[PDB]
Design an enzyme around this catalytic site. Structure first.
Site, PDB file in Angstrom:
ATOM      1  N   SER A 245      49.052  52.764  28.433  1.00 47.60           N
ATOM      2  CA  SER A 245      48.481  53.510  27.019  1.00 47.60           C
ATOM      3  C   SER A 245      48.581  55.075  27.949  1.00 47.60           C
ATOM      4  CB  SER A 245      47.601  52.703  26.916  1.00 47.60           C
ATOM      5  OG  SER A 245      46.399  52.047  27.841  1.00 47.60           O
ATOM      6  N   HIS A 275      49.325  44.151  29.344  1.00 51.13           N
ATOM      7  CA  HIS A 275      48.121  45.697  29.427  1.00 51.13           C
ATOM      8  C   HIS A 275      47.193  45.432  28.800  1.00 51.13           C
ATOM      9  CE1 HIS A 275      47.010  49.407  29.788  1.00 51.13           C
ATOM     10  NE2 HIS A 275      46.974  50.244  28.773  1.00 51.13           N
ATOM     11  N   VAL A 316      42.229  32.854  38.027  1.00 51.71           N
ATOM     12  CA  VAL A 316      41.619  33.355  36.979  1.00 51.71           C
ATOM     13  C   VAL A 316      41.262  34.179  36.967  1.00 51.71           C
ATOM     14  CG1 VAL A 316      38.742  32.973  37.292  1.00 51.71           C
ATOM     15  CG2 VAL A 316      39.795  31.353  39.022  1.00 51.71           C
ATOM     16  N   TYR A 319      39.414  38.979  37.661  1.00 50.34           N
ATOM     17  CA  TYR A 319      39.198  38.549  38.618  1.00 50.34           C
ATOM     18  C   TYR A 319      39.839  39.397  39.468  1.00 50.34           C
ATOM     19  CZ  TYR A 319      34.501  36.037  38.098  1.00 50.34           C
ATOM     20  OH  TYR A 319      32.884  36.315  37.525  1.00 50.34           O
ATOM     21  N   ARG A 330      32.186  48.764  35.528  1.00 50.65           N
ATOM     22  CA  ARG A 330      31.929  48.508  34.544  1.00 50.65           C
ATOM     23  C   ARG A 330      31.651  47.704  33.990  1.00 50.65           C
ATOM     24  NH1 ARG A 330      38.168  49.966  32.833  1.00 50.65           N
ATOM     25  NH2 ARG A 330      38.407  48.714  34.549  1.00 50.65           N
ATOM     26  N   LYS A 371      43.747  39.573  46.442  1.00 52.67           N
ATOM     27  CA  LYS A 371      43.600  40.251  47.932  1.00 52.67           C
ATOM     28  C   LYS A 371      42.140  40.409  46.967  1.00 52.67           C
ATOM     29  CE  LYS A 371      47.845  42.699  46.345  1.00 52.67           C
ATOM     30  NZ  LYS A 371      48.330  43.386  46.544  1.00 52.67           N
ATOM     31  N   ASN A 376      36.373  42.200  37.211  1.00 52.03           N
ATOM     32  CA  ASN A 376      36.589  43.485  36.289  1.00 52.03           C
ATOM     33  C   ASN A 376      36.277  43.057  35.315  1.00 52.03           C
ATOM     34  OD1 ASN A 376      38.685  42.316  34.613  1.00 52.03           O
ATOM     35  ND2 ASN A 376      39.586  42.729  36.147  1.00 52.03           N
TER      36      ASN A 376
END
Lengths: 434, 434
Positions: A245, A275, A316, A319, A330, A371, A376
Site C-alpha cells: 500500500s 496484504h 498460526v 505470529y 504495536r 524463523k 504481531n
C-alpha cells in the site's frame, strides 16, 4: 499562536534538501548487490527505495524518526478525553520530525474537521455501489473520485514550478486525510449515505472521535472505543516503504498523479489478500479455536490445539511476521490498552488471544518451522474491534485503509519537496537470466 | 477447431515452469550492484523485476518474444478488412510465445465480442460521474468497479490451489479486455450511456472495429481509422515492466488483488502527467509551432523554432529515447501507415510532424543535450488521431489505457502461473545512507 502544520513543515524542508544534496554527492557509492533471487523474489531484501518517516529497528521494532511506540505513547498529545495518542499527532511527527504541542494538535484537528465534507457527486457515486461490492473496492473507488477536488492536478495543468510541487501536494493530503473517515463510514453504512454524508462534525473534537461519530459510536458511552480507535489508527499509519500500500502510493505518485489517485492505488494494494487480511484471518482463527476448545479451557487445551494446527501443515496467524526477539511493539501497545479495561479482560475471546500469546511462542519455537515465533499487531487488533461491536471482519481492512493514509501521504509530500523522479526499474525476461 | 487461447497457454506453461526452475537454481548468482543513485533515483537502471513478453533491444527497439514491429506486421493476422495487425493477435503472441493462425484469431475476437457486456451497476456508476471528472479517473474507477465480476476474487475466497491461480486470472483478464473498450467508449460519450452501454457488438468483427463502433465511428467509411486504431492498440500493448502502468499492475497484482483492481492501479499510474501525457504534449507543441511559423516557412524557420525551444531550457516532446540509436520502430510503423493514405498526407499538421522528424534530429544532435535524438511513437500518434476527428487531446490517454491492458494482463497471468511472490523491496531513510 504557534506554527501550524504547513509552517512547521516549511521550517524543516531546507535541512532535508541539504541532507539530500549531501547524499546525492555519494550517488556513485555502492550499497548492495542484486542477485537473481531478488529479480524473481519480488525484490525481497533489495534496499532500493527512500522512506523517511519510519525505519524498522531489528531490536525495538518500527520507529518514527527514532521514536519507539513507547516513546510516542508518552510524548504525543492526547484528546480532550482519553488516554491514547492521537493519529493527527502521529501525522505531525511523521511529517515534521517533531512532536507537536497539544495546542498545535487541537488546531490541526480543527482543520481536519472543517475539511471533512464531501461533494454531492461522491455520495451519488457511493449510492450506485451494489451490496455485493467488496468494501475495499468501494473505498479505493471513492478516494480516487475525490481527485475532482485536487489542487495538485489543477495547478500542474496551469503550470507549476517543481520547487512548488509540495504545497498543493500537502493541501491535497490534508484534504484526503480529512475526508477519508467520512468515506469509510459511508462504506460501513450503505443505507445512511445521505445523512452520514452531510453530518456535521464537532470541530472541537479529534479525528478518531469524529470517525467514531460517523460510524454511529459517538458520545461518552463509547470513550474506550475512541481510545482504541485512536491507538489503532496511530499504530498502523506507517511501516516503511516496502509494503504494497505504501509502495503503490509512492509509485503512482512518482508519475505526478495527485494524492487522491496515488492513495487509491495504495488501497487497491491493501485490498489484496496477501496484504490487508491478516487481522481478519486472526479473528477467524481465534473464533474457530474458541468453538472447538470451549469457553472455559485449560492451558493444555490451547497448547494442544496449536500442535494440532501445526501438525496439519497450517500456520498460526498473527505470529512470526517479524525479525524481532520479542513481540511487535504495536501488539504490546494494544495489550497495554487492554490491561487497563476490565470489560475487555473479561471477554473470553480476548482471554484466548492473551493465553495464546503466552503459549504459542514456545510451541512455534519447538516446532521450528517459523524463523520468529512472536505475535504481531494483527494478533490483537481484530479481537479488540470485535469486543466493541465491530463483528463483521470484512470491514476491518477499511479501518486499516483509514490509518494507512497517514504514512504514505507524508512520504508523497516529501517525495515532491525533494523532487524525487518517476519510479522506473528495469525489467528482464527469464531467458535473459542465463 | 484449432486450440483456443486458454489451451494454447496451458501447453506452454510447463516449459516456462521448467525454465523458471533452471533460473531459480542460480538464485545466488550476482547480476548487478545497487548504488545510492538507484535508491534516490526511482530505481533507475536497477534490473530488479521480471517481465516476459517484451524486451527492449538497443538496436531494434521493443521486441515481443524476439519479434520486431516489422516481424509482427508481416506475421500477425489482420481483420476481415484492412491492412494492419490486430491487437488480439498481439495479445495471443505476448501470452503464448506464438503466432496464432487467422482462424484462431477470429475465434478469440468472437469471445471478446461475446464478453463485452456490462452489469447495470457499472452503467449507474458511470452516470454518477460529473462532467468535470478527468477521463482517466473515470476509466480507472470503472475498471476497478468491475471487480464485482471477478472470478479470481471469488475463487481465492473459496480456497484455491496456488498452481491453479492462473486460470481464474486468465478468465478475469479476458473479461477485462473484452469490456474495457466499452468502458472507454462511455468515457468518450457520457450522453449516450444508455445505448453505448448495452449496444450489441458484431461478433464477426474484431476488437478494434467494435471499439470504433462504440465510439460512433463504425462502418466502411471509417476503414482507415479502424486500421489506425488496430495499429495503435497493438503498438502500445507492452513496453517492458518498468513503466508505471505496467509496474503498478504487477505490484498490486502481487498481493493477489484481482486483474480489475490491479489494472485500475495501472491506469491511475497512466493518469500521471509523467506517464500518459506525451501524445497530448506533442500535438499541442506542433500546433503552437504551426501557429508561430505561419503560412510560409522554410526549413530554417522550423530549425530556428527548435533552437528557441531548447535555448529556453525546454524539451522537444516526442524526441529522445533513453537507449535506442534509431527512430522508435513504433514511430516508423505509424509513418508507414500514413505514407499509404493520401487523405492523411493532405493534412497540414501531419506534414509538419513529418518535416520536424527530418530536421529535429540533426538540431538536437548539434545541441548535444538530448541523449538519443530520434522520434518515438508519441511524435506521430496524437496527430493521426487528430486527423480522424479525435480533437480533444484530454481523451488520448484513454485510448492508451485500452491498449496498455494487453501487456500487463499477460504478465499477471504469468506471474500467477509461475507463483511469483508479493513485491516487497526494502526502504531506507536519508540518514540511513550515511
Amino acid at each position: 499562536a504557534e506554527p501550524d502544520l504547513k509552517t512547521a513543515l516549511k521550517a524543516v524542508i531546507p535541512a532535508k534538501r541539504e541532507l539530500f544534496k549531501q547524499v546525492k554527492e555519494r550517488s556513485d557509492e555502492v550499497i548492495g548487490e542484486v542477485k537473481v533471487a531478488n529479480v524473481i523474489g519480488g525484490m525481497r531484501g533489495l534496499k532500493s527505495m527512500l522512506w523517511e518517516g519510519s525505519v524498522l529497528d531489528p531490536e525495538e521494532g518500527i520507529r518514527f524518526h527514532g521514536k519507539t511506540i513507547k516513546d510516542c505513547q508518552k510524548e504525543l498529545p492526547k484528546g480532550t478525553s482519553g488516554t491514547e495518542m492521537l493519529p493527527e499527532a502521529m501525522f505531525w511527527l511523521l511529517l515534521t520530525g517533531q512532536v507537536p504541542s497539544t495546542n498545535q494538535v487541537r488546531a490541526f484537528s480543527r482543520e481536519l474537521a472543517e475539511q471533512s465534507h464531501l461533494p454531492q457527486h461522491i455520495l451519488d457515486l457511493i449510492k450506485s455501489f451494489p451490496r455485493s461490492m467488496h468494501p475495499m473496492t468501494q473505498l479505493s473507488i471513492a478516494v480516487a473520485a475525490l481527485n475532482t477536488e485536487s489542487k495538485f492536478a489543477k495547478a500542474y495543468e496551469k503550470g507549476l514550478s517543481k520547487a512548488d510541487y509540495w504545497e498543493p501536494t500537502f493541501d491535497d493530503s490534508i484534504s484526503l486525510l480529512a475526508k477519508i473517515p467520512r468515506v469509510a463510514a459511508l462504506v460501513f453504512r450503505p443505507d445512511e449515505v445521505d445523512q452520514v454524508g452531510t453530518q456535521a462534525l464537532d470541530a472541537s473534537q479529534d479525528w478518531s472521535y469524529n470517525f467514531a461519530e460517523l460510524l454511529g459510536k459517538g458520545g461518552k458511552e463509547n470513550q474506550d472505543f475512541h481510545d482504541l480507535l485512536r491507538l489503532y489508527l496511530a499504530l498502523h499509519g506507517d511501516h516503511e516503504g516496502g509494503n504494497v500500500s505504501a509502495h503503490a502510493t509512492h509509485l503512482v505518485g512518482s508519475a505526478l498523479s495527485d494524492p487522491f489517485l496515488s492513495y487509491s492505488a495504495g488501497l487497491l494494494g491493501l485490498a489484496g489478500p496477501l496484504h490487508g487480511l491478516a487481522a481478519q484471518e486472526v479473528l477467524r482463527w481465534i473464533l474457530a479455536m474458541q468453538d472447538k476448545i470451549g469457553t472455559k479451557f485449560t492451558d493444555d487445551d490451547v497448547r494442544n490445539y496449536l500442535w494440532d494446527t501445526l501438525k496439519s501443515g497450517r500456520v498460526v496467524p498473527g505470529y512470526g511476521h517479524g525479525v524481532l526477539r520479542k513481540p511487535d511493539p504495536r501488539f504490546q501497545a494494544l495489550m497495554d490498552f487492554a490491561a487497563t479495561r476490565p470489560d475487555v479482560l473479561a471477554n473470553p475471546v480476548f482471554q484466548l488471544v492473551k493465553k495464546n500469546s503466552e503459549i504459542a511462542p514456545a510451541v512455534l519455537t519447538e516446532h521450528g518451522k517459523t524463523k520468529n515465533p512472536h505475535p504481531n499487531v494483527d494478533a490483537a487488533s481484530g479481537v479488540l474491534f470485535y469486543h466493541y461491536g465491530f463483528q463483521q471482519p470484512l470491514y476491518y481492512t477499511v479501518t486499516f485503509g483509514v490509518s494507512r493514509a497517514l504514512g504514505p501521504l507524508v512520504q508523497l509530500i516529501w517525495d515532491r519537496a525533494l523532487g524525487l523522479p518517476i519510479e522506473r526499474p528495469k525489467s528482464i525476461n527469464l531467458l535473459g537470466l542465463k
